[PDB]
């Protein structure tokens, strides 16, 4: 079990989780997610 492939996989699954929530927040209250306070 390649730690490096395990890491690429955690990164992938994180980005999946965030896009999922991203969709469900757009079609819901029209809100766009971010990781830093926007302006």
């Amino acid at each position: 079990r390649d730690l490096i492939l395990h890491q690429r996989e955690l990164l992938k699954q994180w980005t999946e989780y965030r896009e999922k929530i991203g969709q469900e927040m757009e079609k819901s209250m029209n809100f766009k997610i971010f990781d830093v306070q926007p302006e």
């Binding site: 690429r8 997610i33 971010f34 830093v36």
Partner: protein, 339 residues
Amino acid sequence: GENLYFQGSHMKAIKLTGHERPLTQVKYNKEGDLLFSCSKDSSASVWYSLNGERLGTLDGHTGTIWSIDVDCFTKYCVTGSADYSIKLWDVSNGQCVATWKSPVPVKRVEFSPCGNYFLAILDNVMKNPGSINIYEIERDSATHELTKVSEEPIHKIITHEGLDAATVAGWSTKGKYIIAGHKDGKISKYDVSNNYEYVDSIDLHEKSISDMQFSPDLTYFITSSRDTNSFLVDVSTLQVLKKYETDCPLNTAVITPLKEFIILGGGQEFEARFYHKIFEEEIGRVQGHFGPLNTVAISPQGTSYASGGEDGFIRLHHFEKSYFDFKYDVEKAAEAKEH
């Protein structure tokens, strides 16, 4: 002999002295240019985050201030105190402009994302079972200035059947839910639009939840406990995404903007620990306190953080180049394989 490093520091810290007593809470405002703090003293402090200079103090309470928040306009801050009161203050001049009374100590206050409401945690004491009270502030549309307050909360969320009393709480995105942490290590969720009705809850920790702080966008959050663990948890389903295991009892935790880290702090009667948020691994330890860390906060731009200790000190940190360049090799591959 002298300690030498391959690269530049991760951060520079300065020490703020003001409080003669153990810190209870630090908090940045929205633009991240101000830091608010409270401690076991009866006055709170306001600092410039750029150079640590004290702008002024908030005087009026008669005991420990357990908690302090600042609204999104940086017009008012709110404090809750062992003296059985809540106070609203004008930040520009330090004046108390509203007070509410409680029959019990108030352990935590927090504004809703849009500034019109705040919540307050009322401790359980004797036959009082504890509650989360929600107060409304009516604002002038133009100046953001206060126009009306009522003496009563508009809703009291009484400790719910089969939960111990709440210790921490906050608002999810656009104030649609309130998430609460409890003395039995549970978490629960209340639907704001449907009269603050219970939705769901979960076991999570073995001891009392000691802090809970949200992500930049309020869609997930991080908890910490003196059982030495910390959890990342998603608002919408309350599922656990990540667990951070330490050998240290935890008083405080935050999610960093901009970098994918977590900061944890605590201690036994002293160093903040950074973890990678996704890989769940310790990436560093930042020394400087003389006793346990009681509170940590991070600026909303992710360019500094502050920690307050049992020693009475606030340490303010500005992140340097090696911090913003900190990357796993896989993350380096992710970034470069974009453009």
